[PDB]
Curated annotation (Swiss-Prot), chain D:
Family according to the record: Belongs to the SPT6 family.
Lineage of origin: Eukaryota, Metazoa, Chordata, Craniata, Vertebrata
SH2 domain mapped to chain residues: 89-179
Tissue specificity: Ubiquitously expressed.
Phosphotyrosine: residues carrying this PTM: Y263
Localization, UniProt: Nucleus
Recorded superkingdom: Eukaryota
Function: Histone H3-H4 chaperone that plays a key role in the regulation of transcription elongation and mRNA processing. Enhances the transcription elongation by RNA polymerase II (RNAPII) and is also required for the efficient activation of transcriptional elongation by the HIV-1 nuclear transcriptional activator, Tat. Besides chaperoning histones in transcription, acts to transport and splice mRNA by forming a complex with IWS1 and the C-terminal domain (CTD) of the RNAPII subunit RPB1 (POLR2A).
Quaternary structure, from the entry: Interacts with RNA polymerase II and the DRB sensitivity-inducing factor complex (DSIF complex), which is composed of SUPT5H and SUPT4H1. Interacts with KDM6A. Interacts (via SH2 domain) with SETD1A. Interacts (via SH2 domain) with POLR2A phosphorylated at 'Ser-2'. Interacts with IWS1, AICDA and PAAF1. Interacts with histone H2B and H3. Interacts with WDR43. (Microbial infection) Interacts with human cytomegalovirus/HHV-5 protein UL69.
Protein name: Transcription elongation factor SPT6
Originating organism: Homo sapiens
UniProt gene name: SUPT6H
Residues annotated as domain S1 motif: 27-83
Full-protein interval shown: 1151 to 1519 of 1726
Disulphide-bonded residues: none
Length: 126, 171, 31, 267, 78
């Protein structure tokens, strides 16, 4: 039953807080900054490493202020919380690419309404 | 997907760890207990960000241990089926393609591959080009996918990707 | 151990009752 | 290389090859090595040719590590060196010691030199012994509980120059006081008997003195006789100043300037 | 607004001493100077007289509430 395409999420995960791929990179980097210092401390696992490079390959932006911006303009609309990260990491070019990839965007908004937001993202992409 | 939830844990503490750096030791024993694990309820837990509070430690009657119900705020990574993610291409084989989504890897058979991306074992790099050799999709390419089925294997998630939807390639 | 905490100690002040007059030595400067 | 399976190209000069001497022909130690190479230790390996063998330099029956100086596993020899040398104003002391034996080395330095020694109570602790007076030393058992971090243990130069050097500079001023004594270590029986003998020669002018404890180092004794009853007031020396009636003085002079106008109350 | 008795009942003294002596025998750092003894019940009793046992007592009340009282807060009886 669990399909995020039809937006069905468990109760433990409905109230959860989504995160962006560029967003969590700064947290992981900060934790790496903390653990790389403070000696007589354990070194970081390889799982930490395999997620560092992972979100590093998909950093659409590296500014701290750029992150809250792209979400401020999204939460102003009437989108789901689940749509918040998948539509902020992939950064599709056309709104047809977005609606074809995400089935919940089809019929959810107007095409040009969607595309203006999409262009905002490509403008924010560094 | 990377999320941010407040999780809880109750840890036991041996009486030799009482004394001045007690709560610091509770922190230590939490950092190195619930980091980098995975579950069939919350999924893969990346790292813990902060520790909300330490409960009061109830001395176990009979034994010397005292357990400490601590709630923490960590970032967890739970993929759902049908989510459309980016990943990097790890291994190109006639049996299927291997990718890696952060801490969890997936695999794509030629059944999920339409016949355009043909095999290329004659080349030194195994890639999946097409008939006129313009779209070259080889190892180490940020190739999107769609998780069409999840699987956790003894505290280890293993989903399965596909290539049937359009705009699943190079950006 | 044989050498416990020395400076974490609490200096108890001693109370008294001596209703004397004022015939003592003056103060000085701080430089 | 076909039977023993160990040639001279694997074993090199400079690397330590463990040579197990199991017997000796005449004066040497001819045994086997780890690779079956017949390790024949010569008389230069034991350092004795007409006297007893190198039993102190090569373990007879066991394996003895030596610096490999000959690759002769096919020649039934092993140039393995039996010697260990063949295989290869406010001072701050160090210690890589106990408390009784440390008391005998810290009596010969001057006033201000601070020693560094491991603790003896617990784990990952360090005790800062700094010189106070003649025979008085404060063993700051940090965790005198001075709570610190965990980044500072790599550099042991600032925990003294921020917490003990100002403490030693504040403690040295009371030693050079105009009315200082020792009373054989700051004994409580010897200090009450001095104020009652100094008050008789001058009943009008009342004197004051200053002394420290030997069993509780870091606390000074400020005794005063406002009337025919001796009275003792304590004071603590701090890394930032002094602790007198709970008021912290930045400089050493403000304590006396605050006391000259505070001891005239009836209490 | 703690309303319970301010005295350590005799059951709390038995359980606090037995528990503190178990923690001491499992090598827990003592709060008091040992004048040179080694039994953990003698040590736990010495610590109780110095009011240095690091334990608080959660006194459930019958309605469901509870009150925590440090051990150094209430008046030891024997």
């Amino acid at each position: 039953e669990e399909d995020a395409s039809q937006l069905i999420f468990p109760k433990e995960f409905e109230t959860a807080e989504t995160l962006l791929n560029s967003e969590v990179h700064m947290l992981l980097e900060h934790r790496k900054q903390q653990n790389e210092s403070a000696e007589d401390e354990q070194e970081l696992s390889e799982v930490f490493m395999k997620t560092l490079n992972y979100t590093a390959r998909f950093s659409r932006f590296k500014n701290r202020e750029t992150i809250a911006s792209v979400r401020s303009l999204l939460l102003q609309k009437k989108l789901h919380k689940f749509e918040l990260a998948c539509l902020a990491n992939l950064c599709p070019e056309t709104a047809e690419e977005s609606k074809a990839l995400i089935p919940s965007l089809e019929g959810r908004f107007e095409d040009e309404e969607l595309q203006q937001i999409l262009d905002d993202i490509q403008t924010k992409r560094s | 997907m990377f999320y941010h939830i407040s999780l809880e844990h109750e840890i036991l503490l041996h009486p030799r760890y009482f004394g001045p750096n007690l709560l610091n030791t509770v922190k230590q024993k939490l950092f190195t207990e619930v980091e980098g694990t995975c579950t069939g309820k919350y999924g893969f837990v990346i790292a813990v960000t902060t520790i909300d509070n330490i409960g009061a430690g109830v001395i176990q009657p009979g034994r010397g241990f005292v357990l400490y119900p601590v709630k923490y705020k960590a970032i967890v990574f739970r993929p759902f089926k049908g989510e459309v993610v980016d990943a990097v291409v790890t291994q190109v084989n006639k049996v299927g393609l291997f990718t890696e989504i952060g801490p969890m890897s997936c695999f794509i058979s030629r059944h999920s591959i339409p016949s355009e991306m043909e095999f290329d074992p004659n080349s030194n790099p195994p890639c999946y080009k097409t008939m006129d050799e313009d779209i070259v999709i080889q190892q180490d390419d940020e190739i999107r996918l769609k998780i069409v089925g999840t699987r956790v294997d003894k505290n280890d998630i293993f989903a399965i990707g596909s290539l049937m939807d359009d705009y699943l390639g190079l950006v | 151990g044989a050498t416990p905490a020395y400076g974490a100690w609490s200096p108890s002040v001693g109370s008294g009752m001596t209703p004397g007059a004022a015939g003592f030595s003056p103060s000085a400067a701080s430089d | 290389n076909m039977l023993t399976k160990e040639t001279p190209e694997t074993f090199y000069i400079g690397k330590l090859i463990i040579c197990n001497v199991t017997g000796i022909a005449h004066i040497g130690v001819k045994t086997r090595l780890d690779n079956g190479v017949t390790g024949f230790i010569p008389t230069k390996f034991l350092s004795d040719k007409v006297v007893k063998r190198p039993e102190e330099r090569v373990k007879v029956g066991m394996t003895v590590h030596c610096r490999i100086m000959k690759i002769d596993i096919e020649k039934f020899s092993a140039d393995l060196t039996c010697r260990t040398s063949d295989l290869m104003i406010a001072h701050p002391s160090f210690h890589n010691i106990n408390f009784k034996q440390a008391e005998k080395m810290m009596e010969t330095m001057d006033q201000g030199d601070v020693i560094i020694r491991p603790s003896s109570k617990g784990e990952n602790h360090l005790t800062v012994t700094w010189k106070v007076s003649d025979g008085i030393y404060q063993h700051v058992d940090v965790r005198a509980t001075l709570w610190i971090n965990s980044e500072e243990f790599e550099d042991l130069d600032e925990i003294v120059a921020r917490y003990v050097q100002p403490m030693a500079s504040f403690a040295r001023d009371l030693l050079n006081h105009k009315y200082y004594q020792d009373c054989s270590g700051g004994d409580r029986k010897k200090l009450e008997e001095l104020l009652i003998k100094t008050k008789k020669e001058k009943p009008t002018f009342i004197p004051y003195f200053i002394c420290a404890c030997k069993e509780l180092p870091g606390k000074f004794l400020l005794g005063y006789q406002p009337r025919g009853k001796p009275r003792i007031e304590y004071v603590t020396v701090t890394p930032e100043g002094f602790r007198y009636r709970g008021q912290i003085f930045p400089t050493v002079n403000g304590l006396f300037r605050w006391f000259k106008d505070h001891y005239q109350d009836p209490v | 607004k703690r309303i319970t008795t301010p005295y350590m009942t005799k059951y709390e003294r038995a359980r606090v001493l037995g528990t503190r002596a178990l923690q001491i025998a499992m090598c827990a750092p003592v709060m008091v100077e040992l004048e040179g003894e080694t039994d953990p019940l003698l040590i736990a009793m010495k610590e109780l007289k110095a009011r240095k046992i690091p334990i608080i007592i959660r006194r459930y009340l019958p309605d469901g509430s509870y009150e925590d009282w440090g051990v150094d807060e209430l008046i030891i009886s024997d």
